[PDB]
Amino acid sequence: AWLEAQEEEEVGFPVTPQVPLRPMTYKAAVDLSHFLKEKGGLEGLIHSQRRQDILDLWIYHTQGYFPDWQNYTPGPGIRYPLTFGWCYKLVPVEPEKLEEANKDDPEREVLEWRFDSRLAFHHMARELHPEYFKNA
Numbered sequence: 284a285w286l287e288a289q290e291e292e293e294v295g296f297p298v299t300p301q302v303p304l305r306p307m308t309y310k311a312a313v314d315l316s317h318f319l320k321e322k323g324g325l326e327g328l329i330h331s332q333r334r335q336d337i338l339d340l341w342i343y344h345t346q347g348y349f350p351d352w353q354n355y356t357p358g359p360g361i362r363y364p365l366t367f368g369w370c371y372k373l374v375p376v377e378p379e380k381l382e383e384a385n386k387d388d389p390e391r392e393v394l395e396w397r398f399d400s401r402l403a404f405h406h407m408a409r410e411l412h413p414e415y416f417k418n419a
Contacts, residue, residue: 284323302347312352312368313403315342326398330373356412362394363408365415370402 285294305311319325328334339350354365355373362373373394380390402408409416 299344307348307352309368316370325396329393329395370400372397
């Protein structure tokens with residue numbers, strides 16, 4: 284679909300600018316998670332590095348929601364979603380090929396978006412570092 288960029292990508296020409304900034308509901312994240320899923324399937328898509336901006340940006344020229352919800356725990360390697368409802372967890376399933384030798388492009392470990400709508404009720408990121416969210 285839109286992720287299957289054969290060669291010369293073509294985002295057609297849909298005119299969708301800053302649309303009425305509605306309130307990003309936690310439910311909005313889960314609904315959005317499944318919306319992007321049926322819109323082709325972002326799951327298993329290896330997040331290179333710029334694809335991240337396309338996501339937040341795409342949401343801009345579409346729902347106009349600001350990326351004040353898209354976030355993740357610091358530190359490299361795995362990366363759990365800080366916000367709740369967002370059932371997306373980045374994880375490097377690639378083999379640690381830290382073979383230092385080729386002086387070409389940086390062959391670092393890339394990450395892939397692991398879709399898991401079960402996060403709609405479970406709470407793993409909370410057991411990791413919840414001290415960031417000060418609710419009560």
